[PDB]
Amino acid sequence: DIGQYIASKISIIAPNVCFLVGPEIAAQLIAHAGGVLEFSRIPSCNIASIGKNKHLSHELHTLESGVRQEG
RNA sequence: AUCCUUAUGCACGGGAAAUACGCAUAUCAGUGAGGAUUCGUCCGAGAUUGUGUUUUUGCUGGUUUAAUUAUAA
């Protein structure tokens, strides 16, 4: 419910990130770090791991892209 | 005044390599290159593209016989 509410009003709270990535994602991001401040405190190398479901030994994942982390 | 730490320059002495060292009126790159993870995160400067030489650069060493002149007539 919170996440869906953020996606509606997010263009007000974070107009830039919803412009680059889009609101459906930025809502998920901000939704994770639980604010704009706490998400801007995050280094950029830690941002790509957010949507990553989980890592487990039998998953068997090497992409053709070379992406280790899909967020 | 002695003693010590870091960085840089010159240098005696001792090693290792030359699939190794460079170059660019060229593209990006701490305003994040390239990776790593135990999935929470963690490390933090090169990567592309073209090219020169690379069983080799410079320098060296070895091997393939003077003049003068003497007899008793």
By C1' distance from the Cα of A32, the closest nucleotide is B40
Q: How far is the CA of A41 from the C1' of B69 (A)?
A: 119
- Report yes or no: A6 and A27 within 8 Å, Cβ to Cβ: yes
Tokens of A58: 């039998």
Q: Closest Cα partner for A23 from A40, A3, A46, A43? A: A3
What gap in Å lies between CA A53 and CA A70, rounded to an integer? Answer: 8
- Other CB atoms within a 10 A radius of the CB of residue A61 amount to 9
> Which bases in strand B are touched by protein, i.e. have an atom under 7 Å from a CB?
32, 34-44
- Report yes or no: A13 and A33 within 8 Å, Cβ to Cβ: no
Resolution in A: 3.4
How is residue A40 annotated by DSSP? H
Class of residue A71 by CB neighbours under 10 A (exposed 0-12, middle 13-18, buried 19+)? middle
CA dihedral A48, A49, A51, A55 (to 10 degrees): 140
Asked if the Cβ of residue A44 lies within 7 A of any atom of strand B, the reply is: yes
- Report yes or no: A71 and A49 within 8 Å, Cβ to Cβ: yes
